[PDB]
Design a protein around this nucleic acid. Sequence first.
DNA 1: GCAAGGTC
Length: 665
Amino acid sequence: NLCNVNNYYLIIAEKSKAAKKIAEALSEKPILCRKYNVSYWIIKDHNSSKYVIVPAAGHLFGLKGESGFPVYDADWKPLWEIDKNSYYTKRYYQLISSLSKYALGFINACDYDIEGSVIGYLIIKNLGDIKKAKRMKFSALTKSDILSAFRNISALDYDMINAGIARHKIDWLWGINVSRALMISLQDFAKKRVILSAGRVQSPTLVQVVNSEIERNLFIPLPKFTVSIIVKIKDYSLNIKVNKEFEKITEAKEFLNKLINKTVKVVEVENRVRLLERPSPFNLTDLQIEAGRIYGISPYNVERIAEDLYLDGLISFPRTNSQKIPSTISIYNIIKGLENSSYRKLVDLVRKITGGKYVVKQGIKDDPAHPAIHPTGEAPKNLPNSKFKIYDLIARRFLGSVSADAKLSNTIYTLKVSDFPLEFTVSYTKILERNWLDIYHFHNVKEDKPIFLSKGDEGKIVDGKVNISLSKPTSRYTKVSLLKWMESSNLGTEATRGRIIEILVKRKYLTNNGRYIIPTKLGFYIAEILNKFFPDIVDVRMTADMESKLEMIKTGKVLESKVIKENIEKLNKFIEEYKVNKDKVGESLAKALGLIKIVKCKYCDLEQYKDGLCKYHYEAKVRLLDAVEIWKERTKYDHKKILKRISSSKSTGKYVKDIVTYMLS
DNA sequence: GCAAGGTC
Ligand SMILES: [Zn+2]
């Protein structure tokens, strides 16, 4: 049988598609084999050496520690021996273990990042011979990249491996201990056993939602005033908002008074042609943001649809931060694949506006292991509309990036009020060449109605208004805008961000208020408890500091052992200081879950704090009265008018509106 | 039991 083979080198890939692609790169007829119901590949013909290519399935090993508190040591163990979720990995473990027995040497061909180095290391270490190990380094999954990596096989980068291991240790230490400190404190106080968690990523994310929700529910809009004018010039009546703001309504009224009756004169005309840049290809964060804005799909669902499309061979590997396509990726093969599909009409358009040359508009962000998300060229069949909407975004985004920047004709009129130092512009845009706007057609570009003015034309300011504008709070969070905030803060990875948000929901820390996501009462107190006794775990700075130490490990500037001991010092010091207050923590937690029931606020479910009000409803009144004074000085309105306008604004925090409502009776 | 991180 063809699948019998001896004296080969064992090439370990991170996933089954990567293994297949490597096998296809090294032989034109690689041998498909099957054992423990896992596919693997034999190469009998690559330059007179034998190779077996076997996929892992993500991590096959994970840290495992003792039970109890606190625990400052853990061991790598088979994931299936500890986690019944990842029982899926056992058959991969068994296959690789079997194949390692006859192998002459081992090559880690997992993805070229910190986690890939660890996955392959632990597999070779525990199932193979780490003394006979080498590394394959490729940043894309093309034959050229793979065969070049294969030719340039090097020794293991232990600095990269140790950074990866350090990341696991740090996250295990803080995640497990602090999560246990939460559960153990409640257990000793309330004699209740509930699942509570904290972590380097999930907890700064919870606190962000909680802090924003607090400031928002306490927000009072403050008033400012701007002036708009009516300009009669020739057949035209122009309504112009003057770029000047006023705190006091009286100085806005004096400004408007000084503009009315004055003459305005066109002093400059500029006809300029602007290029509107075509988009770059998607990274997962861009795709999540766009799919959210255009279709309302949640970032966790976008991640899993993108995965299904990639498992179907329709798009490249989606868990990528890159917005770049490297030169080893055949654009021609994608375009001609998309020609043999329903997109051929758009391809013909791209071929037209480019003169037949497809140049990717390379984005800024990179990824060491993968290029940006792009269609493979394979034509889809039987995509439910939800999976087609994602595929179409990716394909039109890629096709748009290989097309042409759009051309805009801007007519800009500079008008000056004669007898006053005030200039202001009036402009309309007309789209010369839509170009990518017809391909990635998810961008509305406003073409105003043309206005024909000439240098020397004059008009009168015949009217105007003082316009009030009320200040605005921070916006509410959606799952996608939270995703965006995490990426912006460098929390999580393309894979974990969606999932970690869903963890915060499953722990009942956050919940869905329709479109939005809002903290629960449990979430509120967990943020407070964690900021009080474990503030490091609640700041995005912990990830920044950890990333910095990890880059030092990767570059030979520090030892993993130091970083872990330092981490243990900080955690333990908090652990010591914690288990004195550990019954207050359980107490706060007991209140958090509604076990210590309490006297409720006059207006909500929170615990009353002063004058019959919870601490936030009390602060809402303090802040309201301060604001009401500011409104008085600025607007000259009477008290009832101020309240009723504050009660009218969607910007007004809920807690404030409860008090205003009451003040109005 | 709990993290964050791979992938299924
Ligand atoms: Zn209250």
